[PDB]
């Protein structure tokens, strides 16, 4: 469950947050495949509650109603079409599996679901599964509210309701079975793995019992006996009874400490500096690299939710964001996930963004299609960070240097750092308040290399900066602290 199942030479997955199945299919063929992306993390494909107040929030997708593949992203036919098309071009699909719970216990009974399924939270009635009151942890929880009240108690964290969401009795084989049913349907369609939502709220043992029941990957695209890639969402910033290491037997685990710290360093908070990154990874208290799923931001925390609070870098902080993503893609630690967002009318009613609930770009609830601009960016309020030249090019940088050691580290003891990846890549950063101008030892063979930050390599020439590496492998770098993109990156495949 630790291997991504991506093609050889494709080292990252992109989260296409709330995208429609039809758009993802197109994206796989017109961009992801040819630009070297390894896979896509999709939003929950199962039927959820349609919340009308506030109006169709993004988080309604984390409140399941059934396991029918019918959401704002599309129906089963479209989902199947998407997986097939992406797989045919070597781009994998990873499903966001919401299995800890069903909907809010105070939601109202009826058919206000994305597929019209009837459900009654008050009675714990989910006929479309089906689930009854005998399938929820109500009796198992021991809190006065039946909700999670204290994170120092491992048992309530897992047996009580997360903010009122009906907590499934994962201890029962029936429930584990229904879930496996759902997950197997997806595997047979062609999904390469899963993001297990709210793993912190489940017992490692229950998760295990579910994985036990899963099929191997679809033998049309995956060699016989392949296991689904598993990455568990466990928010662990330390000092809690529940530890991310508790989940290592099930697969990888989200390393939230990564983005929190990268965010603090780049924002130069708490007297942190880039030169401190010289021992980035385990050296900073992180989980083993072979179990980490890393990212700068996610859907929760780009909204000041998740974990990291105010330090998290996002598309809103574009210049610094590109730097952080760049550093992540160049550094050997973990399996990387790139975020792809949508713009929302962020509005601070002093302190808090009161619109952090707003769902994807829509017309009366119907998700808007992803349009492409002439400059290869996206319209209809889709941010498409994965299409930003600097990010897209760093995804390819990672592919090219995969497996190379961390070498030729340099720092000015402040915020000017550089490092190479064997003899296949070199990156330079200037996050100080003055120009960086120094001749560095790169570890790269002589020649003219296109900087992939300021431009591209287009057969025979560079459209941005050119770096000349001398036969002694030295190159001169000059980066103004005022540059749009205060970093340079060259690699074996950007060489003329
Ligand atoms: Ca639970
Ligand atoms: Cl996540």
From Swiss-Prot:
Task: Please name the PANTHER family in this protein's record.
Answer: ALPHA-AMYLASE (PTHR43447)
Alphabetized GO MF terms: alpha-amylase activity; calcium ion binding; chloride ion binding
* Recorded catalytic activity of this chain's protein: Endohydrolysis of (1->4)-alpha-D-glucosidic linkages in polysaccharides containing three or more (1->4)-alpha-linked D-glucose units
Give the top-level enzyme category: hydrolase
Protein source organism: Homo sapiens (Human)
Q: What does this protein do?
A: Calcium-binding enzyme that initiates starch digestion in the oral cavity. Catalyzes the hydrolysis of internal (1->4)-alpha-D-glucosidic bonds, yielding a mixture of maltose, isomaltose, small amounts of glucose as well as small linear and branched oligosaccharides called dextrins.
What Gene3D superfamilies does UniProt report for this protein, alphabetically?
Answer: Glycosidases, Golgi alpha-mannosidase II
Task: Give the GO biological process terms.
Answer: carbohydrate metabolic process; oligosaccharide metabolic process
Gene from which the chain derives: AMY1A
Q: Which residues bind Ca(2+)?
A: 100, 158, 167, 201
Which residues are listed under the site Transition state stabilizer?
Answer: 300
Q: How does it assemble?
A: Monomer.
Identify its protein family. Belongs to the glycosyl hydrolase 13 family.
Q: Which GO terms describe its cellular component?
A: extracellular exosome; extracellular space
The organism's superkingdom is given as Eukaryota
**Name recorded for this polypeptide:** Alpha-amylase 1A
Deamidated asparagine modification sites are 350, 412, 459
Q: Which cofactor does it need?
A: Ca(2+); chloride
Which Cys-Cys disulfides exist here? 28-86, 70-115, 141-160, 378-384, 450-462
Which keywords annotate this record? Calcium, Carbohydrate metabolism, Chloride, Disulfide bond, Glycoprotein, Glycosidase, Hydrolase, Metal-binding, Pyrrolidone carboxylic acid, Secreted, Signal
Query: Per its UniProt record, what InterPro entries does this chain match?
Result: A-amylase/branching_C, A-amylase_C, Alpha_amylase, Glyco_hydro_13_cat_dom, Glyco_hydro_b, Glycoside_hydrolase_SF
**What EC number(s) would the UniProt record show?**
3.2.1.1
Q: Which residues bind chloride?
A: 195, 298, 337
